[PDB]
Ligand binder design. Structure first.
Ligand SMILES: C[C@@H]1O[C@H](OP(=O)(O)OP(=O)(O)OC[C@H]2O[C@@H](n3cnc4c(=O)[nH]c(N)nc43)[C@H](O)[C@@H]2O)[C@@H](O)[C@H](O)[C@@H]1O
Length: 268
């Protein structure tokens, strides 16, 4: 019934929710449903959300198990053709929703754009198997996914409080969900061991034969935070387990092509 659904999880968002909503309601060229999933804010959040045009805006306000629980409730109710998720500290840039509608017109399942963070572009990676030894390849708040993409992939895994976004996109890649990356900014905004722990866990969900430290090595290698002289060793160790894994490494690290060809030849 709507081109776009925007799911906005909120808790105590009074300082910025107005700006968030203004970036959504101002979007021209589309019909947009907004679902605000509030976790029981005691501040001005609900009143401010109510200060906007309510025609296509639903407010859920009730306790939840966190951001991704709230997102799941919103996604589950969404009626739009493409579904985006915006945090209250985020803004969509002008004309972004019309750009999503235009770029979704041939039936791609995910349309993702660029993200501006503290005035710099997020260092995005390609949506491909190489992302499976990394994190989320684009900003989650720059992502729009269709009803069918959510039906096929499913919901966000609440076990991940930091990286459920990455884990969902990794599932999309593994499920061969189609994706179109648009080279335009869609969204603007401004404990490391826990983040690293979750990111390594997400990678092991793709490749369960990896030790945590090997998942970490691969993540740091693809992101450029660490060295790569052990990639070939990792490839020899596990290549036989999974053609997807061999593919992921040869994409991430094209210099290991001669060794990856050898894994393919012997095992796949
Ligand atoms: C929206 C998500 O934000 C993540 O940023 P991440 O710093 O964790 O989370 P924050 O930026 O602090 O909060 C994100 C949004 O969720 C709301 N919020 C925070 N906690 C809760 C909660 O317990 N329940 C509900 N209903 N709302 C909550 C907050 O008001 C804000 O709009 C991204 O990493 C994800 O990719 C996605 O963009």
């Amino acid at each position: 019934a709507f081109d776009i659904t925007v799911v906005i999880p909120t808790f105590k968002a009074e300082k910025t929710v107005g700006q968030c909503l203004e970036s959504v309601l101002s979007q021209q060229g589309v019909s947009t449903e907004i679902i605000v999933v509030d976790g029981g804010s005691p501040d001005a959040t609900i009143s401010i959300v109510q200060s906007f045009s309510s025609t296509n805006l639903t407010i859920i306000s009730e306790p939840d198990r966190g951001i991704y629980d709230a997102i799941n409730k919103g996604v589950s109710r969404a009626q739009g053709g493409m579904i985006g998720v915006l945090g209250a500290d985020d803004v969509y840039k002008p004309n972004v929703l019309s750009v999503v509608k235009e770029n979704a017109s041939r039936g791609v399942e995910i349309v993702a754009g660029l993200t501006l963070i503290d005035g710099q572009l997020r260092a995005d990676e390609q949506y491909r198997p190489a992302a499976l030894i990394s994190g989320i390849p684009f900003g989650h708040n720059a992502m729009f996914a269709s009803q069918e993409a959510y039906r096929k992939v499913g919901l966000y895994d609440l076990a991940y409080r930091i990286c459920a976004d990455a884990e969902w996109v990794h599932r999309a890649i593994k499920s061969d969900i189609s994706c179109r990356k648009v080279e335009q900014v869609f969204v603007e905004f401004g404990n490391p061991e826990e983040i690293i722990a979750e990111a390594c866990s997400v990678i092991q969900r793709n490749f369960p034969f990896l030790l945590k430290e090997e998942a970490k090595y691969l993540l740091y290698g693809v992101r450029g935070w660490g060295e790569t002289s052990r990639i070939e060793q990792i490839l020899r160790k596990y290549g036989h387990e999974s053609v997807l894994f061999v593919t992921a490494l040869q994409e991430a690290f094209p210099a290991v092509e001669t060794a990856a060809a050898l894994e393919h030849h012997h095992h796949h």
